[PDB]
């Protein structure tokens, strides 16, 4: 018993030359459809995907009726009609997740048997069928009902060759003046609110179409003896665009020699991070089949080091 | 013994005591204006983030002011006596964004600069003594902060208002059985949903502190009467949070001979708008703490699980 990540039910005749306009390999999906109608057939379709690809099948006159999907709008239901003879595609009807309707039909011959299509998830990867002068046959490729959409195998392939730009900023300054002849001891304390940020760029509307999560560690900064290095922290699950608020702290004892002053300044390092990334988008269906698409882009991040301090005697 | 605030008052012995402090509601210093004479600080006017405003001593045309930006705190502060040590003589501070404010006496020698421990740099107000002039003053600071957590979350009107669950359709399919025996099919559906939670805050606590909320979310729950609100499992949240997920439905469809069953997948969506009360707790690095009661509105968006109506023709 085999299961599949996509579903395709083609309708019409046996004529024409095979065509396939599929955004499967990069998770590109149907953005816009334009349909031209003849007397006894669908004459042509123009189809746009979310990655910019645009293709025409059959032929397009100016009876052309269009529909552009909104971001996050999917297909609730779809019906295809043959032309009655069983030799052409006769009509296309769909209704979206937002109740918007699109209907393109034969002008001359009336419609006959209506095939109601299982749309799976309603997320369409494009179309497949046969065409020449007309659309002999066509179906819509759908991803079956989705269980999860996770970006994983996260890599920062240039991180190992780049140094962090860490800018220091002062947080607090305090002075202790010992004008006695007994050593003194105080406790210094300081805190700072910080907001860390992580963004993975996405394309082809995958952020609005799929509920994305990212299983990965994020770029952090490590202070070593020589300077600063990039590492990647513990793996966890993230939104594609995320921020984390936190309070950093620092405390230590300060010993103040007899007849001396010590001045303490607390600082933190802040790094804007801009790095290319590679990962894979795995879409896993309810049925257990899956779809992988390689991803490439830019990680933008904001991070901080731990707080430090300089104590100087005067 | 340890305290959640630190206060060091500089100046003379004279005048009447004042304390102008946002501790009880975690309101902080928004703005300060200071008037100076020849041998003293003449007056201060202070505004907190909850709209309170008060003046001590006397204000005149000499006055110079400083208004804090959101998220700006104090990095360093010095105060000087007047060098007779009868009055406050000067105030100086530098912020977390390196803006400076200095106001002093016009004559006279400033003598010993007292460099002040500003704790966390988050100022709750001022305290000192004043008559005609500012005899003495200090700034009240929260000591260094370890955490800032909103807890004991309650929704008091929750049991008294009924959810408004609007239903949406997700998927329709038709199963026609033109055969002489019963047929069985699998129907599957999925939908991306965005859940949202939002606890209102005031007095800039959201930009001064890094807030987290330890609490359950209002959710919708099913009974025979229909739908009521309930509070979910407890976890840690940001004040303003969204959670993306994919809801799914799978069930078998049985179609009698020469019958059609039409299956519509739906989901229920509820906007929530409820009053809340809670406690802001600020815990210091030193182990002390500061509690402030909170009130506001919780806004939310939640979803029921997916369901399906199967209708026999
Ligand atoms: Cl299909
Ligand atoms: Cl100290
Ligand atoms: Cl007095
Ligand atoms: Cl914030």
TrEMBL record, chain A:
Origin: domain of life: Eukaryota
Gene3D superfamilies assigned to the protein according to its UniProt record, in alphabetical order: Jacalin-like lectin domain, Proaerolysin, chain A, domain 3
Residue ranges of every copy of the Jacalin-type lectin domain listed in the record: 5-144
PROSITE patterns given in the database record: JACALIN_LECTIN
InterPro entries: Aerolysin-like (IPR004991), Aerolysin-like_pore-former (IPR053280), Jacalin-like_lectin_dom (IPR001229), Jacalin-like_lectin_dom_sf (IPR036404)
Pfam families per the UniProt record, alphabetical: ETX_MTX2, Jacalin
Listed name of the protein: Natterin-like protein
Organism: Lethenteron camtschaticum (Japanese lamprey)
